[model samples]
Target: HMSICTSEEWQGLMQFTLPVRLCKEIELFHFDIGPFENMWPGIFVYMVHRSCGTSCFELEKLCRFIMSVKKNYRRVPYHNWKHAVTVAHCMYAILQNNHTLFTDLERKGLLIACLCHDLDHRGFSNSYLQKFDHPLAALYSTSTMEQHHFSQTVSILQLEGHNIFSTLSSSEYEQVLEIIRKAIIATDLALYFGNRKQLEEMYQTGSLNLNNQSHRDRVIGLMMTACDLCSVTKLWPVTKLTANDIYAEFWAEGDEMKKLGIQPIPMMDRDKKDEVPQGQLGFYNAVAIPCYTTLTQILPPTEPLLKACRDNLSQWEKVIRGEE
Candidate 1:
């Protein structure tokens, strides 16, 4: 079955429904959301409008509000608003297709979490949080940056900060917190191998029964993790765009390290020519495909898209080797 929300519809939902009221509140508080000429805030507004169904006025107001945040740090390309929006779209798709697995409230809460999951991400990996001993690391005592991202974003959304969900009842608020936490933690790369292995073993042991899972838990877990690593499964052109964005971010981080007289991290500092697609390719061939393949066996309709993803990865290998 085709996924319920197309990419466009997903965008529409966020643009119109989610941020309009908040944007107005921000502007009323007298915050300048943008420089106007740069249009970063405008682009975000347009995205919100397109995705969430917000009107032009609301979009602009929301953009202005987001821009007004004093320490708003913009990461080029991937870590910017686009990434947050992309993750939201992915979360929506998963929810739409697998609604049978979640309660009505859980579905709604998960979508909200996805939209704001990476708000204000600074483009640095979780490693930076540990290296600098950031309060988030101390507070959560979590080594993984993705987990930190989740907690920090949720904290930002609370009443003391943006209070995005302040309108919800106390019960609803607790449910939202649980959904958001699970979705955000799904992005941790450190959990990748273990997560994949668990899926693999489940398939092997004949415990791959989808019927046994709580719909919300299984759907959110699988979908969020898939979206977080979605580059490998996307169309080749889309994958290229994602890969290029990642490379740019890595290069920028390397430059920052150089300026600070710190040793550049591996892969982060490598020249474009020196880095091969081998690592990513091997990941797809050995890990993602196998894991997703087993997933399709348990959920047969997933087969076609999973195969398409495999094809995309093959094409990516060609592009990375300059053979395309």
Candidate 2:
């Protein structure tokens, strides 16, 4: 999906060293990471090492690949490298809590897919791309953004010194990449509703299981939600910060849409910026509540996520009613 770099160029970028603060405060960012005392590279290395655990794995090569992927991210507001790291951080947090939950392949694939899911995101939704008849819409015809992100993820892996999967046998590599493909595409909200119901039934019947590939794939998709709109379930200060940044990105896209004479949704309309309270309320009920409830049902320890989201929802209700 993109050009490659020389071996030394990418190799030089892979320090794979973690700063003291990040290793110390690693658990602080449950549903996020972009704020790491300005040590983005080291923070990333620590994230993977922390999640994947000790190994004879080629750590340096993995670091190089992650760094290369980070470099390729556009400087877009919400979907930049910072956002990618945040998603990866959430994935690490969940795995950390449920130590024996996912298999080795699942853990590895989840970690990488989270980091690479939004690779090179252009701050544009699939709907935006299609409405404007953008090139990506024509190229994919379905899950355009998700597909492009996976393609870019593959692009970095192909770069010199960035093939972190090189050590894995061919079969392992194929299996892992397949997991990644499913996980990345699942981030698209369009598919979440159907998958969410599947999870709902599992949780309802108390039969949620991750042993099967298909079941695990759906689980990963649900996990993606815990990270994707992570801020919604965050504490107030964090949630507000995410909200501001989110709308800033939305309005920016709206500005772009305006250039094409298309009106953005009310949430993206700067003039209706004050409507986030209502929009967030609906979004939380329609999307966040179901997924968080089901996920916490599957893994009780994650109930904190549901608690935090409920807290945020109350806060939003209070503010919307001018109770602030």
Candidate 3:
């Protein structure tokens, strides 16, 4: 039997509040909610339940399901519950503002992909796992952590009380799951540039069509990357806190890399934090800037992100110039 939710889990469930009673009440531009550090699971169920039209019974199950998912995250410095919720909120933010821009299916897909993309992260990068010959590396041979995260999604959905998609027809269910599989793996930065380049070319050539299924899929991939790097498009104080969290996450992994006799990249180097302003500046110029540049070309209302990324780049350049 599905747990009604245990005693502590029931208390946990009550701790989260639905942003609004109905999904249609969400207005992207008007919403001013910041990312609350620990409220993602609450937010996750709200969006999915609202988008998917899940009933109250399943809502209870969804709470338990997320509780299960949360337990699986270790108390790591960065990739813990806070980061998990933050990632989901980034997607929620994107949708609230841009909901009208997406097909209902795409809206649902975006939320699902974003929520599960980093499930059960061990706070380790693929490079970190590969260097140590971690068993997941041998199994996947590449994309080890991403593949594991996807596998975890499937596992959670398979749990008896947690199969929230059960109400959908078999075909519809498979379609949603397939989109999820593709979008989750697409969040990886290793695969990000290719998606970025493909979309960028289509944008530059003026051949991009949101109606084209392939184009739409590629755009979703781009959106995944965009959300993963959503900090750059945020206001300075928000982006600064997010940036610090990410670098802290990197440093934690860097420590592990050193323990295993491998050097971490400059982003992960604690000593290089200040000097890497140029590196970050170059990153935004190369990928982050180009990403939103193409995004607004496709969806003009998203212009805010493009402008914000440009602003964040300027902030980093100030650091590069040794200015306050």
Candidate 4:
């Protein structure tokens, strides 16, 4: 199931005929449109070429890069190829809204960053790594795992037949990589907490100028976090499956840590599984709702996402009360 399609066969994948229903649903950000295993690569390539343009990148290089990206994600319960693909799809859907002011290179880099953001994730939280003195935490004192994810993205881009941005000039290449770096780093929830209020402050004060590069960077970070947690805004069943996978990863780490004389956080403690719905309520209010709420104000097209997140929050409330 992990086998990648051949490079020679990539041409056919680019031409794969998607059903109209699938295409229409993708436009509406309804991700459970078809068999993800069969459709993801085609959808990925479509997104890449469409955002960056076929003339701007080599087809062979793009295909090889996509496969390398897929190959690098480990067999984690969450944060694997499926999550990355879904995040990329979420970014694609957001980019469709014309109110966002991303430049051409920003758009290309953002989609690529979303696709590569969680590469080589070990299914452990950043806090887990830092608390245990993992080498990755030592390498990056702040945003440890996220820095590694960006490094892996750069490594893949340097691989033979995998430089998807080969057509760009040196400056353009450097610029895109920077955009990719910032976008991937912004997916860290720790950073999101620090920046979200400042973003809201800027919006409230009418100082979020799109023409200001610094201000735009903050908005880009906000957008990245929104897409990264887009699972919270997915339809009910999809949200449930995603949440279960996420908690499965968290509990795996908790189990390992508990055996080493550590007490895991309540959310990660399998013994505290009944509190999962309670955690969801906290997570939605603290992270997802604020994320979507901010983005919706900036980009009206994101209202559906905010509405969906509210619906999920209510559903979690019901579950916590044993009414669901």
Candidate 5:
């Protein structure tokens, strides 16, 4: 019973809430409600039961249970529902194409992991942990931001207030924990370059060495990494939204730096006229695009998406050049 609306159906859904022209504009961009549904575990549960089968009920219940616990976690500006939803959608896309690499259990686990991976991101980078001497820095020493996020997720899940996994058999719980651990840790950008290289080599060598790994482990690693680096392979509208989200967060951090009497990141400061496109365009072009393109070649279908990224970057450049 696939009752969910397509992109075409989105306009009708929005019609009552928005003007016809605005609704049309939204539809023109092909935005769907599916990603939003996936962001909240409860909504995802409903969708899964409707789209998949009655067999998904147990998994959906587990997801809703997790959602109840997850609410206790901190909500940061940049890593809130929007970010989680975006990553979940990316994970879904990757999984759709790589289904052979995952099992039903692992697929469900990976979806849950992606939904909860950045549960309480503080909007600043891991460098903040080092700067402020946060306890998470000591607890996780390295990969501070990612470590903090994982710890927060685990802590919430452990609390008597919200132990969703308590009902699961020990073995099942252990499997889920392992999948979550690996997927969540893959959020660490510090390890991204090396991981990407390894994946590339695997593809180039045509050796699915990862085949021996648990389906959860292999797919989560690849999918999470893809989601993390997905900005460089998104449609223009999606890419622009992502860029704006990052810029807004960057500016907020810059404001904090200014308040502390420190020099803000140049790109973050609107007053920094010397920085063309505030270094944002350059960062995407010189660093993000190149990295994503390399991965895209190894991953195929991602090529058009990456091309859209390049187009978006060039569009931004033109805007900076007063062409827009």
Candidate 6:
């Protein structure tokens, strides 16, 4: 089952490298490992089977679930299927390097959550949704898009042929579902802003005990943030392309807001697009660097991610200097 295929084989049964090349070059931790346009469903199934083991799911039902889940991703510029797979790969890499750090249930939940965290994302920020009173905003006063993502995940599970967790006992299923919900909701950067300082303090003060459930929950939350923004920790070529797409998505929302007679924030405004390099520098310094730095302390295997973030920060600085 280890045979891989080109994208042209997609109209029929999908195939991926089972026991996906976990070697260094193809390693999920630092490699792009994708055209990532279509193979994610099979790739996701392989990761889930490898992590949770085949005993936890029926391959058929898992395929159905993965297909159904991906179908919900709208054709957004950044937060699309490709983004989900890349984020999940980061989690897979984290779990791979440090399997002993999480329980089997936690591992299952984290992988699934990383894959579905932004289900049905509409390419707009939470602020954009809230400011316009989008329906999801009315439904969840906080973490609007995140809550919607989790809800959609639940919906997919309920659909026939999609409950891949059917093999679990009621209690295990309930627990994993809860993990899925909490992990998905934590992807909202709004929530991250409020809690990240406390996370940093925990590691800085030597109080981050992995045995404590609350402390572990905080760690999980931080991992979700790190995995979500991992583009900053990739090679410069890939990092630049992802940033351009993200900004394009932002500017698309900005264009819409302008049409509605509202002024978008500077990052979203297309007119200020020239300032993107400076914003990139600030993002790496203020958010991305500190995040990967703290994560590297908590899990030393993740140090490569931090190193790549620093490297990319320098690259962004170079871009800024060249533009001047």
- Colliding pairs, model 2: none
Residue 117 miss distance in model 4 (angstroms): 0.2
Clashing pairs in 6: none
Model 1: residues with Cα > 4 Å off, grouped in runs: 1-73, 132-135, 159-169, 208-219, 258-266, 320-322
Of the candidates shown, which would achieve the greatest TM-score relative to the real structure? 4
lDDT of 4 by residue, 73-166 (tens): 9999999989998899888888877424678888889989999999899899898889999998999998999999999888888777778887
* TM-scores, one per candidate: 0.69, 0.92, 0.86, 0.94, 0.74, 0.92
Candidate 6 achieves a global lDDT of 0.82
Where is model 4 poorest over a 10-residue stretch in terms of lDDT? 1-10
Query: If the candidates were sorted by their TM-score against the true structure, best first, what order would they fall in?
Result: 4, 6, 2, 3, 5, 1
- By lDDT, the best candidate is 4
Q: lDDT per model, in order?
A: 0.56, 0.80, 0.72, 0.84, 0.59, 0.82
> What tens-digit string does per-residue lDDT give for candidate 6 at 38-135?
45676777678778896677766666667766778889999998899899989988888889889999998899899889988889889888899988
| Residues 1-324, model 2: lDDT tens digits | 564444564455454456565566677544345455356656666766677765624866776676678777888777887778777777777888886978788788888898899988888888898987899999999999999999988888887767877778899899989989999999999999999999888767877767776787888889987778777766688788878888888998888888888888898899886788999999989998887988887778778788888888899899899997
Candidate 1: 10-residue stretch with minimal lDDT: 26-35
Error of 1 at 17 (Å): 11
Higher-ranked by TM-score: 2 or 4: 4
Question: Against the correct fold, how does model 2 do in TM-score?
Answer: 0.92
Error of 3 at 242 (Å): 1.8
lDDT of 1 at 164: 47
Candidate 5 pairs with clashing backbones: none
lDDT, candidate 5, 1-324, per-residue tens:
101223333232223232334333221112333344432444344333333344643543344345543453346556676666556656666555555556665666676677677866778767656666777787888888776666666766664434545656799888878878888888886766676566666666776455567432543565576666566556656666766677777777777778878787686675764574637687776556755565566556456546666777887788788876
Model 2 clashes, total count: 0
